[PDB]
């Protein structure tokens, strides 16, 4: 077992892999793999109900929110969100703090729903952002259907300590920090979503959590029927065949998070993990992270050579990632757009892996 | 292991399940599960490349076709088809032989692309069709962008033996018979698609095979960017994160199919199994199937109590279903729309399972 710092898909608890291995040919004493079972059958309908409730209880999701498991990554939800939540409103607001919030903004722009202003709150971010632009600089729209933002930017390593204070309901991309800490301010939230492959298992599935009053809004025309979240809610997320393995495996990870003492415990461990990684970049002269303490991500810790933000060198970066690969510290190569290095440490990343990376960097 | 006749998701080769479990914590000596591997890394890009090539080999997909692995089941592709392939044409043709083709037709009608006639070629199908309507009764549209149809209707058990002959390019839902036999006459084909959960593994993923000049057509407005097949092709199905475990597992099944002699061998084994099931239906006064022999599915074999097509009785159905369930013959309950019984027997359905089903049907004391 290597120490895996992949951004996505990412490390998973070893216990969950072992349970899946051991259940693979015969699950729930059914004489079948979870892969082979009808989704209209008793066994699967139990598993999906269980998974939904486990998530309801882990997050303390209020009674006035629906919880959905749906096929497709975060990128598909970028399209679905404006189809579902613009309603009759004449404007939408996107705070683009980095690449992922910018892509979601670009998808809403490109779709070009008639009469709807697609508004970038702080404009496009710079190539290498240091912070979230000041609250007093934010351009908000009069008739905003929602305020979209990304709670944790993976490539930049920018994370909100708390939810923004704005008049419109928040729609929040939590792909890279979902179930990494509790969520407290539910009254502000219209929708929260996350692809599964960062903090709860397989790619190709996302969780979407929606406040019930948001689905009373009319769906825009030409929405694919399965991306209409009202139809999903109505049919128990089984209008068609759901991504059964992904929901099964996510449920095992939900159980594992519970065993570790809920989401508060995850937040503490993740903070302890991030503390050791950021200190090892800061104190060492070979590595640099320009992100400021207020906005530093507990999940994704990017860093470059001293002039690596401005001067891209694929050969210079290559030697350090090989140095890490050679000692079983895998997938520390940064995202291609920025290059450099990135330690992604989600819930399943152990402290043993963090200490090993610290020791490796300190010996560079 | 039970004898599993589920229509979808469906039985998988035990070897593939065993192979997946054995390398679950360490895939090809990488130090990590296939589940934990980056899609941008070297290991994953090889696996997906290999999976694509292997499928190309199995089917002998000609080089004027792209092969896609995409997130989402068949129902999402019902939406994506018209977005991608109407182009500037003023009509689309749908032949509705059963429930799934009708569903595909209804989604295109629902989406309501301005200025496009959504035409049902042979009308809406009856409650219990016994055949595909005769070719000479089909009413095709003048400027049709494509001719859409379902090669195997899972609930009705109606399967085409060969592709239809029509002017427009074919768009074919092969969800329930994909890789159950060879495909020829690629010149007739605009697009073929199949969700994975009948004949190549995990639900949540579909294969889409597209003739390259079909993607020269302009996409309709409001297409979600991940559902624009040009965008998928342009980014090697890695515009965003692909459903990696589904593709990996699909590839394991592709290898298993090659090990068993290829698609022509699958066709022979599936015909053997189907013939036994149909002879158990036909030769027994307690069971009936109405589908004409030329249209009988190899993959899905509905059958009923003697009067079960038009006279529904779920209690009488429940007696034989439970008779089967108490012998570990599982999910012989037919789709809720029709009641009665259905044996679904895809590639991985063991001959032993069919033998156990035939024995149950022979020993049933009767209705």
Q: Overview of this structure, please?
A:
The structure is a homodimer. With 364 residues, chain A is α/β, with parallel strands linked by helices. Chain A folds into two domains: 14-260, 3-Layer(aba) Sandwich (Aspartate Aminotransferase, domain 2); 261-364, Aspartate Aminotransferase, domain 1 (Alpha-Beta Complex), CATH 3.90.1150. Chain A is built from nine helices and 13 strands. A seven-stranded mixed β-sheet of chain A has the order 2-10-9-8-5-3-4, sandwiched between helices. In chain A, α3 crosses α4 and α7 (262-282) packs parallel to α9. The longest helix of chain A has 21 residues, at 262-282. At the A-B interface, α1, α3, α4 and α6 of A face α1, α3, α4 and α6 of B. Chain B: It catalyses: O-phospho-L-serine + 2-oxoglutarate = 3-phosphooxypyruvate + L-glutamate. Chain B: Its EC number is 2.6.1.52.
Q: What level of helicity do the residues of chain A show?
A: 25-40%
Broad structural category of chain A: alpha/beta
The CATH topology of the largest domain in chain A turns out to be Aspartate Aminotransferase, domain 2
Q: Give the termini distance of chain A in whole angstroms.
A: 23 Å
User: So, the CATH homologous superfamily of the largest domain in chain A?
Assistant: Type I PLP-dependent aspartate aminotransferase-like (Major domain)
CATH class of the largest domain in chain A: Alpha Beta
Q: In what order do the strands lie side by side in the largest sheet of chain A? A: 2-10-9-8-5-3-4
Query: How many strands in all of chain A?
Result: 13
* Radius of gyration over C-alpha positions of chain A, nearest whole angstrom: 21 Å
* Main sheet makeup of chain A: 7 strands, mixed
C-alpha geometry of chain A: globular
Order of H and E elements of chain A: EHHEHEHEEEEEEEHHHEHEEH
